Design a protein around this ligand. Structure first.
Ligand SMILES: O=C(N[C@H](c1ccc(-c2ccccc2)cc1)c1cccs1)[C@H]1CCCNC1
Length: 137
């Protein structure tokens, strides 16, 4: 096992009808197929579940790249910090954002996330898709 193990991504949205999450321990190619649904205008946060196993890690960063076909990447970096080893997993949450609204805002966005640190270590790099819809269905 590695020192840092990213286990789960969750979109914390209080107005959502059900859970919006994805297991990050399985196959990484199957993650692209899975599409995450977010109603337009919804307030949300990105939650990263991860474990520290042996030693204190420092300088953790969450890096998120959002792609729409034919558009320049929308980048965002979040400082995660230092964490010590323990059996229970940790939870890092981004600040609240508001998903865009309107027909021009609806559609599927292609995300590539990076859980890394100051040492540019690849704790986990994965792809996932987010669909902005007029309603939750
Ligand atoms: O719509 C915006 N950016 C969008 C976007 C859409 C969705 C996300 C996302 C990804 C992952 C999770 C949650 C949400 C991220 C960005 C675009 C990206 C690339 C080309 S446009 C502006 C307008 C108002 C809201 N703040 C930013």
């Amino acid at each position: 096992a590695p020192n840092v193990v990213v286990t789960r991504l969750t979109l914390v949205c209080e107005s959502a009808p059900g859970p919006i999450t994805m297991d990050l321990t399985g196959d990484l190619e199957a993650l692209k197929k899975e599409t995450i649904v977010l109603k337009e205008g919804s307030e949300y946060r990105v939650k990263i579940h991860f474990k520290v196993n042996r030693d204190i890690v420092s300088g953790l960063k969450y890096v998120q790249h959002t792609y729409r076909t034919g558009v320049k990447v929308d980048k965002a970096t979040f400082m995660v910090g230092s964490y010590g080893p323990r059996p229970e997993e940790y939870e890092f949450l981004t600040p609240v954002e508001e998903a865009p609204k309107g027909m021009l805002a609806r559609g599927t966005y292609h995300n590539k996330s990076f859980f890394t640190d100051d040492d540019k270590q690849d704790h986990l790099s994965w792809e996932w898709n987010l669909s902005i819809k007029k309603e939750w269905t």
